[PDB]
């Protein structure tokens, strides 16, 4: 039986462990996790939310950008709708509020407390702006939840409100975040409305937003201050149309995502996207591939990022229907040896379950990971809501935020076992060891 | 422990995956799946229905021939009965209908609707031929289901019927399919009865059959236009008698099927079958074998097709009772290296569960696959009927048709991962990679 | 402990069986099941589709009236929604199809299979009328699934169609069912389009609709030949609005439906509706009640039918939350004694689980039964069909959300229940619904005797 | 077999339903539920927190009196423990906070988030008063969670605080709720500290406490504005000690609580307490009973309320160990006939599982119901909360140990039960608790009829 032993043994994440190396690290938080998503796109955490229609739309995209990562919006929708999602991601970081909740001076405390829990936002609005007329919108005062805790249901909103003269107002529609933070701190207030010279209520700035924006400090932003976001396209005819309309809406990178990335359809597409001037303005990521040969071919075809993995995913029907694939650790080992030498970063899409699995991916040479099942069912994932249902039905996992922080925590910890202080070090310094059948079960 | 490491490691389908290779394919349907069942028997799809008494009798045999494959009728029955099955398979493609459902002009609409759902065919008959007398059978008219939807239960069939003069009739018992299709199209009708010069109702041709015959266009046919079909025989004394009576009935190939194909009983039999002139008119397939040595021996013994697999089947009691066998991927790898060089095609009988498993078999060198559990319980498999019971009891799987189409779809897709555009390419171009324990469980 | 000995014992359907009596019935369908829903509404079968939002909307009320009973549209919905529902019902016996599936001469046989199987109706359409322009709409021909069975996907429609000169046509937008039946026979065709003096496509009449209206000969109809359907209101100031518009929508009866009908709220609602001309034109059914006294009270208020049952509803939660009710069989025995002496029909609402339960309800005095649980989850019941684990279910979003198991179509179910009931009448020696009411005799079971069934 | 035919049949809550009667009620909250716990104690809602060690201690008795009923502190504890509990209850309506969370000018914003979220109370505190020394305690300012939202962890408190000259202050340690309400309005602040003539921090009053006392307008109060709470004793020589100290602790009623109250032990206990001035100053509730005779016996002994139920308690094991009891509904029907003819209220203790059960109990004659099982495992019930398998439970160590399933907060539960009961009153045609008692009519169910609910 000769032919039956030429066949190499491929390894997946669960086949190996990170051998512990000497660590000079002397600080729980001194490891740096900055990486590169593609050739000209750095990320502060190396986590990418997957372009699966059960994972990443606007909410997911915004959340991960803010945690310092990024999501790639799926393509299983219209072109218009995909850019609809995209255009919303770019507005997400605005601390200005058009159309804030208004109220008239002669309504009662019962109505004030009605409008404070309007079905518009979760938790309600934090205040109401007291205006003279719902079409004029001249600022007369402000009313918070506090101002109503001691008044009768049928009491004049005009009496409880803080009057506009006693308010901190601003007439500068292009006001900084630094300056509005100053006005909030200087006036011991949490609401700075923005008024025209006339007196009109143009915008509202509230301290919730100012706090949430000073918080997410590792956030991955573009040049114009908006949140980074990627979009996924196919290889068909109408897919070049989709790719133009997506860079219009504001895509920062485009990901071409076919099942078999080592194809002519993909190579041709990458060459196309990097060729036309309407789309070469953003980095072009290609996948999925699993061989070293595939890697050279796609970098050659002009690609700025590779996505690694032909069939290892939570929904890799590929191996049951086609019987194709590569165990994902080998696929990363083989594909990063090529793409590293050509300065091309790689996403390790597929097959990740633990944070420890993420250290394994990075140490095998990956620059980022694409997360699948691990994010489906989180608040910001799509699907009605304890369980979430989009067809599909996954249990609720909570907010994406603290799930990715513990995830980065694990990698940070995994890096320390490799004695690495940076993502590049993690890639170069990690040495693996295989386990057997009985080896995983402990 | 020296002797305990000379022993080679054998691989089964679930041990390996198809590594993805560059695919120049630029069309979802451009891969060709034609193959060869034996030396002088081509098939359009490489799927063979197994000679198990729970899988392939006349219904199964006809279905798979029509999908462009073939079944091999089992031998666990009489000789007469086996050719009974066979003689029926060869009549299956006739678009002529002897003894069509007749009715007399003076019966009522209630009786007309009775005879339309006679317990003879599923869904009923599509029409009734109105004749003057049940022994004479002179054509007076035709009555469809439509003609009765507006008539009272006790109404004259003679009034509702379309009269024979207003019908499209033909007097040509040897009429083409092309010509009868023309008469149906030219007369906007779906029934063309065939009458003697006298006036008698000899045959009926109906559009259901004409449609179903223009549909199954990849159908595997013999020279005389009948559907291909194979038969299985043993190696005993009465088995040579069975083999003569089977080529009489119309067998296109004979399969000798012993548990241990690498025997003298089999070699002797193959030599016998290829020797006698009553049986050398059809190709002779031999099995089952699992070693390269076995392959040479049986081609030498005059065989035109090899069946690969000593004990990997869904009911391979072989390994528990005798402890013999070979992991089926190695068995195919080793046995096709020999039989390819001698232009002899191989069936990869045993152990297939997914379509992906089928790509694996083809890529390991097989020319066709023999399907077992995957077809038991389909409509056209034997056994009363939700579950089917023949003793045995399997759940109902539906119609064989759409199960084999998705199956060929998977192989077609599996081929694309190998970068193959034809069965030969799939065999030559596929390169495998092994998975470990943890490697299959993702 | 005497205070506890003067509490009477109420009985429910599982406490009794019908004592068999001498049956002079031979022909198992010389048994009449017609009855009255209210004073001025007769039904062919005594089944009613309960006004629950998991049971009766457009499609259930249609099915139920075609089978010979009636459905009561629920009110857990806006007024506009309840009247829209009622309006769909009131036009489902029309055999004139407005705007039927068109197609133009130069499209392909591929473009035609696409048009025929598109789910315009549940299943699809059976022909496409061939016009020259989707606006002018002059009729040139007709194409049916059969014209396509022998052409490549690339063949034009003009190629395979039957031209208009060889179809049967009419210009009488007011054509009688007879008349069109006639043209379909005489011309041996299944489609008669109705065209304008010009030649434009105005309407299409298909054989299938003609064959429906010729079948369901038991269908519950109003004077204009439309399906009977009721609608439900409550007892708030706005339910008067709701009623008014439901009548203008064409409701045939209103059912005032509160969980405690023996109340001034309920009475005053019934008196309102009777005293307004915009609603007094239709029968007023009031409930729910469960004493003789309540019956007498709502009949005095004006009610044209009573709905019986405080408590026994399947997904009724009255018993647990409030601890109030009356076992249903006792309830029906008490109220209908009152209601028969004044000519007011009763609906026995709640707790029915088998046709034998329906037998017991009618035997105990009732004219009609309301079925919620037994009908929910059918084809024609509301809620979307979704597959899980090789089994089908229905999901009904927004309620008074949950998943009931798919029961198939309601027509066969309703026809067994009527058969079951006809069978039970034969045990009572009853050739009519009224006979069932007067003749039935009950015997009580202990818990043991229930296990024996 | 005659000896077995003269045994009467007692009924329990599942044997009956309330027969609906004519309801003249329109406004679903023109239904009064106030009632009497004993001769000289009225409650707004007829619910009582049973004196079981898995149900009523400090936090349950507070919640129950704020909701408008009362809790009975259990005695499975030392005397000191029972009086400590009662004392915590008697001071939970005080809006003066003694020793509130301090902090000194030179600490960090990190040192302040630490102080605000520390679980002084369940949730934390809302401000930290800024004093210069943890001993002298002169007030300099106030810091709230909002003052911190825009400063690095390393910023001083003096930096972000509001200085005392810009706060609203008072020096009246006797300030009225009105007065402080007034300063909170007029100064648009949520905190009014009370300081000394010097400037030391004496007390702090927060808006939240002011908003509580302005809400719970139904709270059960004593003459000094404190929550009503009862406490339980037994019938041993030392229970006299226990009672004496429980009264000096401020108990509002005592509940003598043995499993067989129709006994000289029980009677003699009731007579004792009435004849000692150190305890006769509060109402004496005696139980448990279950016959008319026992009622008459304890009323004669002096009892100001009776507790009904020998047996039906959830974790009562009387029936199995002793084989004694009376079905609860029969028990209540028997005793309250006696008790109404003498002006003594009754508590129906034991066996309640739904609001409809509460409806049946009041309808059968009772003035108040005791709930053990239904309240155990709530937020305010005793026992520690621990998580297992994605579900929360409570563990109550040392008993009369086990794990009950977390039910949430008791206020919503108590408010449904009252709603449920109000609903049941509407079936009885009852606009008051007494009306419920006089008007309710029962009907019996067989086992079958119970399944139908």
TrEMBL record, chains C, D:
It comes from the Eukaryota. It catalyses: IMP + NH4(+) + NADP(+) = GMP + NADPH + 2 H(+); IMP + NAD(+) + H2O = XMP + NADH + H(+). The active site is at residue 316. Homotetramer. GTP binds at residues 91, 101, 121, 126-127, 209, 212. GO terms for cellular component: cytoplasm; glycosome; nucleolus; nucleoplasm. Residues 96-159, 161-223 form the CBS domain. GMP 1 binds at residues 50, 314, 318, 349, 351, 372-373, 399-400. NAD(+) binds at residues 257-259, 309-311. It comes from Trypanosoma brucei brucei (strain 927/4 GUTat10.1). GMP 2 binds at residues 91, 101, 126-127, 208-209. It is an enzyme of class 1 (oxidoreductase). This is Inosine-5'-monophosphate dehydrogenase. Keywords: CBS domain, Glycosome, GMP biosynthesis, GTP-binding, Metal-binding, NAD, NADP, Nucleotide-binding, Oxidoreductase, Peroxisome, Potassium, Purine biosynthesis, Purine metabolism, Repeat. Catalyzes the irreversible NADPH-dependent deamination of GMP to IMP. It functions in the conversion of nucleobase, nucleoside and nucleotide derivatives of G to A nucleotides, and in maintaining the intracellular balance of A and G nucleotides. K(+) binds at residues 311, 313, 316. Belongs to the IMPDH/GMPR family. NCBIfam families: IMP_dehydrog. GO terms for molecular function: GMP reductase activity; GTP binding; IMP dehydrogenase activity; metal ion binding. Its EC number is 1.1.1.205. GO terms for biological process: GMP biosynthetic process; GTP biosynthetic process; purine nucleobase metabolic process. PANTHER family: GMP REDUCTASE, INOSINE-5-MONOPHOSPHATE DEHYDROGENASE RELATED.
């Amino acid at each position: 039986f000769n032919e039956s032993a030429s066949i190499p043994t491929g390894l997946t994440y669960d086949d190996v462990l990170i051998i512990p190396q000497h660590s000079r690290v002397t600080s729980r938080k001194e490891v740096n996790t900055t990486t590169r998503l593609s050739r000209n796109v750095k990320l502060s955490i190396p986590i990418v939310a997957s372009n699966m229609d059960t994972v990443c739309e606007q909410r997911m995209a915004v959340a991960m950008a803010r945690e310092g990562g990024i999501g790639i919006l799926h393509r299983f929708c219209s072109i218009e709708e995909q850019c609809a999602m995209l255009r919303e991601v770019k507005r997400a970081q605005s601390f200005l509020i058009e159309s804030p909740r208004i109220i008239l001076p002669h309504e009662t405390a019962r109505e004030a407390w009605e409008g404070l829990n309007w079905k518009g936002r979760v938790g309600g609005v934090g205040c109401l702006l007291v205006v003279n007329c719902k079409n004029e919108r001249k600022l007369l005062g402000i009313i918070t939840r506090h101002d109503l805790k001691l008044a009768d249901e049928s009491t004049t909103v005009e009496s409880l409100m803080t009057p506009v003269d006693k308010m901190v107002v601003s007439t500068n529609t292009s006001i900084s975040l630094e300056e509005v933070t100053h006005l909030m701190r200087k006036g011991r207030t949490a609401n700075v409305p923005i008024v025209g010279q006339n007196g009109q209520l143009l915008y509202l700035v509230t301290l919730s937003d100012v706090v949430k924006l000073r918080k997410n400090k590792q956030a991955s932003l573009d040049s114009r201050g908006r949140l980074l976001v990627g979009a996924a396209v196919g290889v068909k005819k109408d897919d070049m149309n989709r790719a133009i309309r997506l860079v219009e809406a504001g895509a920062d990178v485009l990901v071409v995502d076919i099942a078999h990335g080592h194809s002519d359809l993909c190579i041709n597409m990458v060459k196309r996207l990097k060729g036309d001037p309407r789309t070469a303005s953003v980095d072009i990521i290609a996948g999925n591939i699993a061989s070293a040969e595939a890697a050279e071919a796609l970098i050659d075809a002009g690609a700025d990022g590779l996505k690694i993995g032909v069939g290892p995913g939570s929904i890799a029907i590929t191996r049951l229907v086609a019987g194709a694939g590569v165990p994902q650790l080998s696929a990363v080992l083989a594909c990063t040896r090529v793409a590293r030498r050509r300065g091309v970063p790689c996403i390790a899409d597929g097959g990740l379950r633990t944070s420890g699995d993420i250290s394994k991916a990075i140490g095998a040479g990956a620059d980022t990971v694409m997360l699948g099942n691990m994010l489906a069912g989180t608040d910001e994932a799509p699907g009605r809501v304890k369980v979430k249902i989009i067809e599909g039905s996954v249990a609720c996992k909570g907010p994406v935020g603290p799930i990715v922080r513990q995830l980065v925590g694990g990698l940070r910890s995994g890096m320390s076992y490799s004695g690495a202080k940076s993502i590049e070090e993690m890639q170069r310094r990690t040495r693996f060891v295989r386990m057997t059948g009985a080896g995983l079960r402990e």
